[PDB]
UniProtKB/Swiss-Prot annotation:
Family per similarity comment: Belongs to the thioredoxin family. DsbA subfamily.
Entry's Gene Ontology BP terms: cellular response to antibiotic
Full protein name: Thiol:disulfide interchange protein DsbA
Domain Thioredoxin intervals: 1-131
Disulfide pattern: 30-33
Keywords assigned by UniProt, alphabetized: Disulfide bond, Periplasm, Redox-active center, Signal
Organism: Escherichia coli (strain K12)
Result of knocking out the encoding gene: Induction of the PhoP/PhoQ two-component regulatory system, suppressed by 50 uM CuSO(4).
Sample GO molecular function, one term: protein disulfide isomerase activity
Amino acid sequence: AQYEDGKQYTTLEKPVAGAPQVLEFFSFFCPHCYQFEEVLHISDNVKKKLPEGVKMTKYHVNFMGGDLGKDLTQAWAVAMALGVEDKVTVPLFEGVQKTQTIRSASDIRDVFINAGIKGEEYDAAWNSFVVKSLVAQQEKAAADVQLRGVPAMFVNGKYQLNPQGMDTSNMDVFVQQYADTVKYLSEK
Ligand SMILES: CNCc1ccc(Oc2ccccc2)cc1
């Protein structure tokens, strides 16, 4: 009983059938999500412990940042459709929270242009119904679990990570505890 329901994780009372195996939610407006991604590298370290054949999904949410918050969910959909998440995640986080130079949908587009996505390719994707379906999927998954806080991670539709029960004196130990818990939960 080294991992206890209620301590390092909680159990959903209404488990979600058909869910992705590892499902992470975030917002580019979310201060802890900035730490999680830019300083701790949570997603990457989880993936390096996950068993073979367990895939990881990451989705943006609407409920922070009003109008721009919703623009960012559609931009994340563009990032997923074009496969350029690894190129835009850092300048989007920094544009929103560090330099505070992202203030409109056009400013979001600038980050993609600077990362090398051609202007016509971004605009075609942005207006595509493939991207509209990806926005729909992101919203659906958040609604499925009554999501009200980010950062958040879910395993096999049944378990939600609880980082509040982890020591933060050392950032590397914390990340390792987090990844090892996702691994334990995926095996279960
Ligand atoms: C819902 N928030 C989750 C959470 C909990 C603790 C936490 O502590 C850290 C903050 C910054 C850097 C390292 C750890 C960060 C996020």
